Every structure is written in C-alpha cells, then in structure tokens.
Amino acid sequence: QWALEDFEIGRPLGKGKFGNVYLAREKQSKFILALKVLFKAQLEKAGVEHQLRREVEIQSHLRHPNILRLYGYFHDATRVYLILEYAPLGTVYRELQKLSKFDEQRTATYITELANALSYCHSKRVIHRDIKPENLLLGSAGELKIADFGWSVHAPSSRRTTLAGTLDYLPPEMIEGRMHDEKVDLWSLGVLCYEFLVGKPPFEANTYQETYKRISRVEFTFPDFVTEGARDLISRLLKHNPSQRPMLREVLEHPWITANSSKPS
Ligand SMILES: Nc1ncnc2c1ncn2[C@@H]1O[C@H](COP(=O)(O)OP(=O)(O)O)[C@@H](O)[C@H]1O
Ligand SMILES: CCc1ccc(OCC(=O)N2CCCCC2)cc1
Ligand SMILES: [Mg+2]
Ligand SMILES: [Mg+2]
C-alpha cells in the first residue's frame, strides 16, 4: 500500500534509540503527519522485532484523545516506516526544559490527562511501561498524548529484554527483574508528578548503581515548596509494594487533583 514515494519529507522532529522521526506530507491528499524511521540492521542487531510488532499492533488499535494515533506502516529493505499522528506542540520534556518546573495547575491537568489515557489502556490490560517526558507529546490545544508503545505489553509479565538507558522511571519489581503488572504505570505516574513540580525525578543520582539503590529503597525527599496535598498523592503512588499503590480512579478523585486540574475524568 504506502511507500516512500508517496511523501515529501521535511524537518526532523526528533531522535530516539532506534527512531529517526520526520515531519512529512502525503502527496495526493497534502495530509501532514510524522514518519518514524527504523533501520532494519539496527532492529535485527538489538533483537527487538517483537517490540516493533507490539508497537504497531497495540497503538493502531487504541482510540483515545490522550493517546497518539498510529495509522500504518511500510518497509523498503533497509528501513521500516511508522506513519504517526503529528503532535505540533512537541514534547513535555522540551516544555520542562524551557520552564524548569511546572506550577500546580499545569501539573494536575497533565496528571488527569495521563490517568485518563492509562485508565483506558488498563481496561484492555495493556501496560505501557515507558512513561517519561520525552514520550509524552502535545496536541494543537496543548493537550497531552502518550506515545512510543515500543515497550508496551499485556499483563502479567516478566522482562525478557535488556533495560538500555535510564532507570529513573521504573519501579523496584521491574529493575529487580521480578514479575510485574499494571501497577508499574502507577509508580511512573508518581515519579512524573514529582518531576513536574520539582524539576528533576525523585531518585536521580550520578551513577546507575546508586540510582538502583535509591529506587529499591524508595529513598526520596521533598523540597519545602511542595504542598501537603502534592506530597500525599506522590507518597501514595511511590510505594514499594505494588498492591498498595492506588487505582487510577483514586488518582483522578484525589482532593489535590480536583482543586488544581482544569480538565475532567
Ligand atoms: N508524532 C510525533 N510528533 C512530533 N514529534 C515526535 C512524534 N513522535 C516522535 N516525536 C519526537 O521524536 C522523538 C523519538 O520518538 P519515539 O517515538 O519516542 O522514538 P524511540 O522509540 O526511539 O524513543 C520523540 O521523543 C519526540 O521528540
Ligand atoms: C498516508 C497518510 C495517511 C493519513 C491518514 C490516514 O488515515 C487518517 C484517518 O483515519 N483519520 C481519521 C481521524 C481524523 C483524520 C485522520 C492514513 C494514512
Ligand atoms: Mg521514545
Ligand atoms: Mg521505541
């Protein structure tokens, strides 16, 4: 069906481990979209074909305003191309680098949008497992969209692939290679809420080996400016024992989220 010849390619939108992502326009319709380019030698080398397949199958069948659409894919003997919805206001990561920290109202609205999207995923027993600022994109009204389903799965699960880069968003069960379920996305939602308010994630350290210790002990503290209601929410989410983390309905109905968020359930 689609091939490269059908698109005019434009400026680079970003880079990941594998993905080189470009703005593009479809020639006959003039439809503007994002083309995510993957090199086949590099997918074969890392042995992550099953991850690409999961990304395509899970993301193309989900439909939610706070989840990024995938429309299709094609392939050309050196490259695989994923046809994505274009997010014009860029990443939450870039926005945090611009502002240093978010205020309480911005933070609670993003958390509501995230918990809405995750509640929808979990209702299909899809776990994302890689929630972090560079995988959250922003639509034309500034609304948050989860993207990058390459690590996503059905629960319950173990981890059969090597963690590559940062431990900062992963919970204890996951870094210790244990078994895990839906509740890992709850833990990453705690880490995000802290990083939005403070400017850095709560277990950040200078080495892999020390980050690993801080996470497995849940060693975090709060700066004076973080309010009592923020603290309460974050402290309920960052629990070592996954079963004690709240359900997402409890997150969306937490008093501090209802006082501060400018969007609903
Ligand atoms: N649909 C898109 N619209 C705008 N920018 C995007 C989009 N998808 C990816 N990007 C940019 O490209 C980066 C890498 O995309 P990603 O899908 O997260 O690749 P990887 O799987 O390699 O992490 C993102 O962090 C963001 O900067
Ligand atoms: C090749 C470029 C391309 C573009 C679009 C597409 O589907 C578009 C589509 O379903 N909607 C439906 C929701 C609103 C508009 C987008 C498939 C391929
Ligand atoms: Mg990514
Ligand atoms: Mg990926």
Helix (H, G, I), strand (E, B) or coil at 4: helix
Q: Is 148 in the pocket of ligand 1 (CB under 6 A)?
A: yes
Whose tokens are 């880069």? That residue is 165
Contact 71, 31 (CB under 8 A): no
Classify strands 7-15 and 20-26 as parallel, antiparallel or unpaired. antiparallel
Please tell me whether 116 is known to bind a ligand. no
What does this entry list as its resolution, in Å?
1.9
Ligand 2: residue of 6, 31, 85 to mutate (most ligand atoms within 8 A of CB) is 31
Q: Distance between CA atoms of 132 and 87, rounded to whole angstroms?
A: 16
Domain boundaries, the chain: 2-90, 91-261
Q: Distance between CA atoms of 145 and 69, rounded to whole angstroms?
A: 9
Residue 207 CB contacts under 8 Å (≥ 6 apart), including other chains: none
Rounded distance from Cα 18 to ligand 4 centre (Å): 7
Q: Is 71 in the pocket of ligand 2 (CB under 6 A)?
A: yes
Residue nearest to atom 22 of ligand 1 (CA): 16
Contact 110, 102 (CB under 8 A): yes
Nearest to 189 by CA among 143, 120, 246, 145: 246
Please identify which of the residues 6, 76, 103, 130 carries the catalytic annotation. Answer: 130
Whose tokens are 């995923």? That residue is 121
Residues in the chain, overall count: 265
Q: Distance between CA atoms of 60 and 69, rounded to whole angstroms?
A: 7
CATH code for the domain defined by 91-261: 1.10.510.10
Helix (H, G, I), strand (E, B) or coil at 197: helix
CATH class for the region spanning 2-90: alpha beta
- Quick check: is 103 catalytic? no
At 163, list the tokens.
Answer: 């963690």
Contact 62, 126 (CB under 8 A): yes
Q: Distance between CA atoms of 23 and 7, rounded to whole angstroms?
A: 10
Contact 38, 80 (CB under 8 A): yes
Please tell me whether 36 is known to bind a ligand. yes
Residue 24: CA count within 13 A, CB half-sphere:
23
Closest ligand, as measured to the CA of 152 = 4
Contact 105, 259 (CB under 8 A): no
Strand order in the sheet with 79-84: 7-15, 20-26, 32-39, 79-84, 70-75
Contact 101, 92 (CB under 8 A): no
What is the rounded end-to-end Cα distance, in angstroms, of the chain? Answer: 38
**Does this chain's domain 2-90 share its CATH topology with 91-261?**
no
185 exposure class (CB count in 10 Å sphere: 0-12, 13-18, 19+): buried
Nearest to 186 by CA among 127, 226, 254: 127
Contact 10, 24 (CB under 8 A): yes
At 66, list the tokens.
Answer: 């706070």
Rounded distance from Cα 71 to ligand 2 centre (Å): 6
From residue 118, give the alpha-carbon distance in Å to each of 70, 128, 146, 160.
17, 8, 9, 23
* Exp. method: X-ray
250 exposure class (CB count in 10 Å sphere: 0-12, 13-18, 19+): middle
- Can you say how many angstroms the Cα of residue 61 is from the centroid of all Cα atoms in its chain? 17
- Cα dihedral across residues 94, 97, 98, 103: positive or negative: positive
At 194, list the tokens.
Answer: 């802290």
Please tell me whether 86 is known to bind a ligand. yes
Contact 135, 117 (CB under 8 A): no
Q: Distance between CA atoms of 71 and 56, rounded to whole angstroms?
A: 9
Peptide bond before residue 88 is cis, with ω within 30 degrees of 0? no
Please tell me whether 87 is known to bind a ligand. yes
Q: From start to end of 94-184, where are the E strands?
A: 126-127, 136-138, 144-146, 153-154
233 exposure class (CB count in 10 Å sphere: 0-12, 13-18, 19+): buried
Contact 38, 19 (CB under 8 A): yes
DSSP 203: T
Residue nearest to atom 23 of ligand 1 (CA): 16
The total of other beta-carbon atoms located within 10 Å of residue 171's CB is 28
Q: Is 34 in the pocket of ligand 1 (CB under 6 A)?
A: yes
Contact 213, 226 (CB under 8 A): no
Q: Distance between CA atoms of 224 and 202, rounded to whole angstroms?
A: 14
